[PDB]
Amino acid sequence: ESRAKKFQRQHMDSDSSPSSSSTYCNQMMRRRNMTQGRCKPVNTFVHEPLVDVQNVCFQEKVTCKNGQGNCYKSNSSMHITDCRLTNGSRYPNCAYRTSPKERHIIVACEGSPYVPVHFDASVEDS
Amino acid sequence: ESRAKKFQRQHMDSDSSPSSSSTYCNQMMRRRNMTQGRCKPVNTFVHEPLVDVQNVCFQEKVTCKNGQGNCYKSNSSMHITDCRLTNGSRYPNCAYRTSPKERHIIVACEGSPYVPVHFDASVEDS
Amino acid sequence: SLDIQSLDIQCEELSDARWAELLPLLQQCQVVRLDDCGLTEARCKDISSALRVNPALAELNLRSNELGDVGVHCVLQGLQTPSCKIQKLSLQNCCLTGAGCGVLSSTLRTLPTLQELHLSDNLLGDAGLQLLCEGLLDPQCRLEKLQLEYCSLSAASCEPLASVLRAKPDFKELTVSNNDINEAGVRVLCQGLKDSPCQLEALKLESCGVTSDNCRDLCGIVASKASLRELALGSNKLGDVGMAELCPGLLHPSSRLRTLWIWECGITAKGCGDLCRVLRAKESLKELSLAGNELGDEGARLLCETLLEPGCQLESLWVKSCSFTAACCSHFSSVLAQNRFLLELQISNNRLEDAGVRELCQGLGQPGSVLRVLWLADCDVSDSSCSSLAATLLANHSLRELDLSNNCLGDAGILQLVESVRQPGCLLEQLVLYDIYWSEEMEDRLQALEKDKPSLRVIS
Amino acid sequence: SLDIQSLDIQCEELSDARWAELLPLLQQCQVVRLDDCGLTEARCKDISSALRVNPALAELNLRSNELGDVGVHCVLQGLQTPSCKIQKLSLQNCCLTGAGCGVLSSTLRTLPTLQELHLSDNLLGDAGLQLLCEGLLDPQCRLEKLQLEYCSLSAASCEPLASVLRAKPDFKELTVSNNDINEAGVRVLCQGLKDSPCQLEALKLESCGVTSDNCRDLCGIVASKASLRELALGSNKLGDVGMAELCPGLLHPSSRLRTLWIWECGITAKGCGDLCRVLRAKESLKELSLAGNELGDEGARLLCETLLEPGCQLESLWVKSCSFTAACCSHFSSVLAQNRFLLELQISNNRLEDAGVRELCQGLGQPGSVLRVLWLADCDVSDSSCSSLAATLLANHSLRELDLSNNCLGDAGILQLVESVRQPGCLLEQLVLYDIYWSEEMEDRLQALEKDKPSLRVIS
């Protein structure tokens, strides 16, 4: 599994409605294998066409949280859903709060072809 | 399972040699379902034809260990194997000491036909 | 002889062809879990037929399928043969409504083997719950564990539940988390448990609108149920005043509560003081969650003081998002260096920084340390910290699991961790690295490490 | 998605058609156990080919089938695939000989995922074992747990094994019970351990010819392995002098030994007193077997004194066949009434009598008592203590399991028990009644009890 396919597994949900219900994260975090061994503490799904997220790799370059150069902020805000493990959760009972919203996304991009391999952050600038 | 068939399951092994090897009890206590849930602490198998043990019900009447009347001591000493759970065994690992010997047996009998339903004891009187 | 089979499927679409292959397993397995497998009404009719002929079935888990009231009806009919020995049933998140509760209520009158029932994440409402309780009151109902989380229940459901508790001396666990039962609902349940002879082992009322005053009610329960092992009250406005009213019951000699879940309870450094007196007096208390309480560095000092004196035998401390800074880490460092009972420390989502993490590494690096699990997710750990961590991974030999998820590491930090974990002398079994960017070059090194050392699980 | 399946067959004859139906499960199951199922060579090629396409396989247990060196060789080839993830393998009692150790040894070099290997009850002999250690030595061998009970090994096998321990920092468990490795073999093994960096967790040397002098070797292991959790030394002539040599190591600040199994070790009240110094000082010791040692009532008194002191947190005590009399019962009675850690007491095969049993019942019946499991098999119990047993089963509410096997109980006494356990107020979950004779009418009554109260399992 490439970090590129892993990015798709963990962060792409093109076909879902923006308006995620309160049970979306518990479902999806499980279906996309982010609750095996340990509960992934935070995760973001993007409700946009794959090519749109891929193009971000050719948009505004910005610094990644870890100080690497090759992150990119989306030109436009995107429909995303944030998933965040609750402060009560204990493996194997991973419970998530679901927060859908429209935000710019920042991804890291790598490879040939040059594609998203990491979801860095979301930005609320409007 | 009738009480008579229970008695056959727990105490009859007509077909095997009297000279049980050290591993006999380990095998037999498991096969005859006496290591389910808890290891049976002690058991005896009789290496005689079923008809010979059945004949005991028509021999010497003696008091059962618990004070019931309908126990019978066999006129003949019979080939038996005692299985005794080792002092270190802990469920589900049930280990047994195997002791083959010749002894009179005492059984409780009930019913029509009048058959063995309980192995009460062995006796060494010679 | 013995023949025990189990089937556990999660998050799979099951073709008609795979389904046909599974049906004989459904007729044979002691344990069947089909979680989020897209089960429909028609498959519920197959399930029903297969279970009618399964004399071995002890556990059936169909959570997260859109069964609906009709679907559930069909599955319950499959449990109604004389051969059925089901002990555990989950219908969590199954689109069950108040309209399906009559059928569930009548079924529950006829399954004396059934001991555990999970109905969470189903919109049952008060009327459905009340109807259910009628079945549960039947002497033939022998349920001991009931989970009703997010069931759309209010305080009106608590009287019916209290009556079920009074009727069942064998009751073991009640969960009603995520229902707005509120102060009066909580009081009525507590009275119900107090009246009941049940040796209850676990009570969970998280996000229930439990109040400070309800802590006098719960005080009574903790004082009264020596059987109680687990008490979960997270996400309620208990406050320091609530802690002050609870802790008297926790200090009763007869209490042997093992696990106390009070995350996000409005507790500060002051209530933390009350809890420290409990920790020092009660060696029975093994697991404590204060996650998401604003304890600050003074709460951390108070906890660590108690963890450094004889008495406290706490085994796991969950203090994620407690508003701790680097300044508390010299106290946790002494704890790790000296305390021989504490095996798990979750201190994620605190601004410990490289300075604070470095101090933790110093304490854990001391000979004789015992910590097994350390969670340091989102603690502002950078590549600097990784040299300290790499050193501790070779100096300490008790640690089995380390979580560094969601920190600002990259290739250089991870490389240092790799150089330690790759060595035969490093006995770490699990390294959790979610939400961290590394290069495809590092990815290959990690996959190489995985392959060369399969005893170590690298999770992301 | 996840698809987790398991299959566990024990003591069953499998027809060619049944075997045909099972074989597909061998392709899918994470855990496969086929124990004493008359497996042959022909079935080994089947297994081999089925396992080769199984990407889930973590555990394979083929105990008690006459596979032979050839059968086994066949099975192992099924495991040499690039995606093999097997972690646990049992070939116990499989008719392997030293002749088959060459191939096994070579195969062992090729399975780095393999962590646990059971080879007990195979006539391996010294030569075979030495051939295996050649494999174990390969840095590609990652075994952490090895069981070699009843493998016909002598002292000559211990330096080969000592070399393996020295080679393995991740080693966790070694069992060599029921081999005459004797004083010299034991010393060599302990030296290998002391020299090893392994954080060993379990060491089992029961019926190994362990001597009193060897207890000085073992003392050093216990003092120096803080990771050690279980030490099994039963059926060895340790004696009171051996116990005294073990104690200094057990008393070491660093020792957190959890389980100490020293049944039939020639220990008397004298060695018991030395051991009670360890128990009062080490709260970490949770499980202790002294079964089959002649402790007498003095030994009981010492244990009960210790159980009534703060620092002893023993949870389970196994003192079956300890030459106790009814005189020890007032001591144990105080323990049951006052001690809040002891959950399990095995006191079977002691001449406690009806008098002694009523005394125990008085103690257990006291408010606040916590015992969960009481074994009183063959304690000269009759109908005369059944009113006491029946009363206790309603007054105490902690007890979950009671073993009264092999006593002189009749219908009258059993009836009094049934009268208690049938009540909803009685929370007993298991009643063991092996070798007790009751009428056809009592039989009918007990079978009905079983159906009517399925939360209570009656065993005979």
PDB file of N, CA, C and O in Angstrom, chain D residues 130-161:
ATOM      1  N   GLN D 130      19.563 -30.903  20.659  1.00  0.00           N
ATOM      2  CA  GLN D 130      20.785 -30.183  20.262  1.00  0.00           C
ATOM      3  C   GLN D 130      20.688 -29.735  18.791  1.00  0.00           C
ATOM      4  O   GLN D 130      21.077 -28.641  18.453  1.00  0.00           O
ATOM      5  N   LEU D 131      20.124 -30.595  17.954  1.00  0.00           N
ATOM      6  CA  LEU D 131      19.880 -30.282  16.557  1.00  0.00           C
ATOM      7  C   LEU D 131      18.903 -29.115  16.393  1.00  0.00           C
ATOM      8  O   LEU D 131      19.099 -28.260  15.547  1.00  0.00           O
ATOM      9  N   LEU D 132      17.868 -29.077  17.225  1.00  0.00           N
ATOM     10  CA  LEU D 132      16.921 -27.967  17.279  1.00  0.00           C
ATOM     11  C   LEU D 132      17.554 -26.653  17.695  1.00  0.00           C
ATOM     12  O   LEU D 132      17.229 -25.591  17.136  1.00  0.00           O
ATOM     13  N   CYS D 133      18.428 -26.701  18.706  1.00  0.00           N
ATOM     14  CA  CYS D 133      19.077 -25.484  19.206  1.00  0.00           C
ATOM     15  C   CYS D 133      19.951 -24.828  18.146  1.00  0.00           C
ATOM     16  O   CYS D 133      20.113 -23.615  18.152  1.00  0.00           O
ATOM     17  N   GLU D 134      20.488 -25.638  17.232  1.00  0.00           N
ATOM     18  CA  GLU D 134      21.196 -25.106  16.051  1.00  0.00           C
ATOM     19  C   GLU D 134      20.290 -24.155  15.273  1.00  0.00           C
ATOM     20  O   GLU D 134      20.716 -23.057  14.917  1.00  0.00           O
ATOM     21  N   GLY D 135      19.035 -24.564  15.065  1.00  0.00           N
ATOM     22  CA  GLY D 135      18.007 -23.700  14.475  1.00  0.00           C
ATOM     23  C   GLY D 135      17.679 -22.491  15.334  1.00  0.00           C
ATOM     24  O   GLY D 135      17.690 -21.335  14.867  1.00  0.00           O
ATOM     25  N   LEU D 136      17.437 -22.742  16.612  1.00  0.00           N
ATOM     26  CA  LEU D 136      17.014 -21.690  17.522  1.00  0.00           C
ATOM     27  C   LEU D 136      18.057 -20.584  17.574  1.00  0.00           C
ATOM     28  O   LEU D 136      17.730 -19.408  17.715  1.00  0.00           O
ATOM     29  N   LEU D 137      19.319 -20.971  17.394  1.00  0.00           N
ATOM     30  CA  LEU D 137      20.429 -20.012  17.432  1.00  0.00           C
ATOM     31  C   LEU D 137      20.485 -19.008  16.254  1.00  0.00           C
ATOM     32  O   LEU D 137      20.998 -17.886  16.387  1.00  0.00           O
ATOM     33  N   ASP D 138      19.929 -19.406  15.124  1.00  0.00           N
ATOM     34  CA  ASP D 138      19.868 -18.556  13.932  1.00  0.00           C
ATOM     35  C   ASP D 138      19.233 -17.205  14.305  1.00  0.00           C
ATOM     36  O   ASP D 138      18.180 -17.197  14.930  1.00  0.00           O
ATOM     37  N   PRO D 139      19.876 -16.052  13.955  1.00  0.00           N
ATOM     38  CA  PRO D 139      19.256 -14.782  14.378  1.00  0.00           C
ATOM     39  C   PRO D 139      17.885 -14.553  13.732  1.00  0.00           C
ATOM     40  O   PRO D 139      17.168 -13.634  14.104  1.00  0.00           O
ATOM     41  N   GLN D 140      17.532 -15.400  12.774  1.00  0.00           N
ATOM     42  CA  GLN D 140      16.219 -15.347  12.148  1.00  0.00           C
ATOM     43  C   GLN D 140      15.144 -16.039  12.980  1.00  0.00           C
ATOM     44  O   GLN D 140      13.961 -15.815  12.746  1.00  0.00           O
ATOM     45  N   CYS D 141      15.558 -16.891  13.918  1.00  0.00           N
ATOM     46  CA  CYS D 141      14.632 -17.476  14.882  1.00  0.00           C
ATOM     47  C   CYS D 141      14.275 -16.430  15.944  1.00  0.00           C
ATOM     48  O   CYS D 141      15.153 -15.864  16.618  1.00  0.00           O
ATOM     49  N   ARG D 142      12.980 -16.157  16.075  1.00  0.00           N
ATOM     50  CA  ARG D 142      12.498 -15.117  16.991  1.00  0.00           C
ATOM     51  C   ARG D 142      11.571 -15.675  18.094  1.00  0.00           C
ATOM     52  O   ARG D 142      10.811 -14.917  18.673  1.00  0.00           O
ATOM     53  N   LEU D 143      11.652 -16.981  18.353  1.00  0.00           N
ATOM     54  CA  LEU D 143      10.884 -17.652  19.411  1.00  0.00           C
ATOM     55  C   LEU D 143      11.047 -16.938  20.741  1.00  0.00           C
ATOM     56  O   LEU D 143      12.167 -16.540  21.099  1.00  0.00           O
ATOM     57  N   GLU D 144       9.946 -16.763  21.456  1.00  0.00           N
ATOM     58  CA  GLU D 144      10.001 -16.152  22.770  1.00  0.00           C
ATOM     59  C   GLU D 144       9.571 -17.135  23.865  1.00  0.00           C
ATOM     60  O   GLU D 144       9.914 -16.943  25.039  1.00  0.00           O
ATOM     61  N   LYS D 145       8.813 -18.152  23.472  1.00  0.00           N
ATOM     62  CA  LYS D 145       8.226 -19.145  24.395  1.00  0.00           C
ATOM     63  C   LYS D 145       8.421 -20.560  23.857  1.00  0.00           C
ATOM     64  O   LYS D 145       8.092 -20.861  22.703  1.00  0.00           O
ATOM     65  N   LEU D 146       8.978 -21.433  24.689  1.00  0.00           N
ATOM     66  CA  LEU D 146       9.304 -22.780  24.297  1.00  0.00           C
ATOM     67  C   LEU D 146       8.939 -23.777  25.412  1.00  0.00           C
ATOM     68  O   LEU D 146       9.371 -23.613  26.568  1.00  0.00           O
ATOM     69  N   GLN D 147       8.134 -24.774  25.062  1.00  0.00           N
ATOM     70  CA  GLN D 147       7.670 -25.798  26.027  1.00  0.00           C
ATOM     71  C   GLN D 147       8.212 -27.131  25.553  1.00  0.00           C
ATOM     72  O   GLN D 147       8.007 -27.542  24.391  1.00  0.00           O
ATOM     73  N   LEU D 148       8.992 -27.753  26.432  1.00  0.00           N
ATOM     74  CA  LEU D 148       9.666 -29.012  26.148  1.00  0.00           C
ATOM     75  C   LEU D 148       9.446 -30.041  27.230  1.00  0.00           C
ATOM     76  O   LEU D 148      10.350 -30.822  27.532  1.00  0.00           O
ATOM     77  N   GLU D 149       8.227 -30.085  27.776  1.00  0.00           N
ATOM     78  CA  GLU D 149       7.911 -31.053  28.821  1.00  0.00           C
ATOM     79  C   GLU D 149       7.836 -32.467  28.323  1.00  0.00           C
ATOM     80  O   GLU D 149       7.272 -32.720  27.223  1.00  0.00           O
ATOM     81  N   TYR D 150       8.366 -33.402  29.130  1.00  0.00           N
ATOM     82  CA  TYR D 150       8.396 -34.816  28.732  1.00  0.00           C
ATOM     83  C   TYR D 150       9.012 -34.994  27.354  1.00  0.00           C
ATOM     84  O   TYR D 150       8.377 -35.564  26.451  1.00  0.00           O
ATOM     85  N   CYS D 151      10.221 -34.497  27.159  1.00  0.00           N
ATOM     86  CA  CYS D 151      10.857 -34.634  25.862  1.00  0.00           C
ATOM     87  C   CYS D 151      12.085 -35.549  25.888  1.00  0.00           C
ATOM     88  O   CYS D 151      12.849 -35.563  24.916  1.00  0.00           O
ATOM     89  N   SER D 152      12.252 -36.302  26.993  1.00  0.00           N
ATOM     90  CA  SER D 152      13.401 -37.237  27.215  1.00  0.00           C
ATOM     91  C   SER D 152      14.725 -36.516  27.199  1.00  0.00           C
ATOM     92  O   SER D 152      15.726 -36.982  26.598  1.00  0.00           O
ATOM     93  N   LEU D 153      14.752 -35.344  27.813  1.00  0.00           N
ATOM     94  CA  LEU D 153      15.988 -34.634  27.860  1.00  0.00           C
ATOM     95  C   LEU D 153      16.677 -34.887  29.196  1.00  0.00           C
ATOM     96  O   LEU D 153      16.008 -35.112  30.215  1.00  0.00           O
ATOM     97  N   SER D 154      18.013 -34.868  29.163  1.00  0.00           N
ATOM     98  CA  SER D 154      18.848 -35.005  30.354  1.00  0.00           C
ATOM     99  C   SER D 154      19.640 -33.703  30.539  1.00  0.00           C
ATOM    100  O   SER D 154      19.429 -32.708  29.815  1.00  0.00           O
ATOM    101  N   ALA D 155      20.530 -33.688  31.525  1.00  0.00           N
ATOM    102  CA  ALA D 155      21.453 -32.578  31.724  1.00  0.00           C
ATOM    103  C   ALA D 155      22.231 -32.156  30.457  1.00  0.00           C
ATOM    104  O   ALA D 155      22.583 -30.965  30.301  1.00  0.00           O
ATOM    105  N   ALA D 156      22.493 -33.101  29.555  1.00  0.00           N
ATOM    106  CA  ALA D 156      23.284 -32.787  28.325  1.00  0.00           C
ATOM    107  C   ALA D 156      22.561 -31.808  27.430  1.00  0.00           C
ATOM    108  O   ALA D 156      23.182 -31.188  26.565  1.00  0.00           O
ATOM    109  N   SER D 157      21.251 -31.675  27.638  1.00  0.00           N
ATOM    110  CA  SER D 157      20.443 -30.746  26.860  1.00  0.00           C
ATOM    111  C   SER D 157      20.505 -29.330  27.395  1.00  0.00           C
ATOM    112  O   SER D 157      20.082 -28.404  26.709  1.00  0.00           O
ATOM    113  N   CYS D 158      21.030 -29.133  28.606  1.00  0.00           N
ATOM    114  CA  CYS D 158      20.953 -27.811  29.227  1.00  0.00           C
ATOM    115  C   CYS D 158      21.938 -26.758  28.740  1.00  0.00           C
ATOM    116  O   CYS D 158      21.633 -25.578  28.808  1.00  0.00           O
ATOM    117  N   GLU D 159      23.135 -27.152  28.310  1.00  0.00           N
ATOM    118  CA  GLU D 159      24.050 -26.148  27.780  1.00  0.00           C
ATOM    119  C   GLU D 159      23.652 -25.679  26.375  1.00  0.00           C
ATOM    120  O   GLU D 159      23.765 -24.507  26.088  1.00  0.00           O
ATOM    121  N   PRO D 160      23.234 -26.593  25.488  1.00  0.00           N
ATOM    122  CA  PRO D 160      22.542 -26.131  24.269  1.00  0.00           C
ATOM    123  C   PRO D 160      21.439 -25.094  24.528  1.00  0.00           C
ATOM    124  O   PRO D 160      21.405 -24.075  23.841  1.00  0.00           O
ATOM    125  N   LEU D 161      20.570 -25.326  25.517  1.00  0.00           N
ATOM    126  CA  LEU D 161      19.477 -24.403  25.819  1.00  0.00           C
ATOM    127  C   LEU D 161      19.987 -23.130  26.421  1.00  0.00           C
ATOM    128  O   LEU D 161      19.473 -22.040  26.120  1.00  0.00           O
TER     129      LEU D 161
END
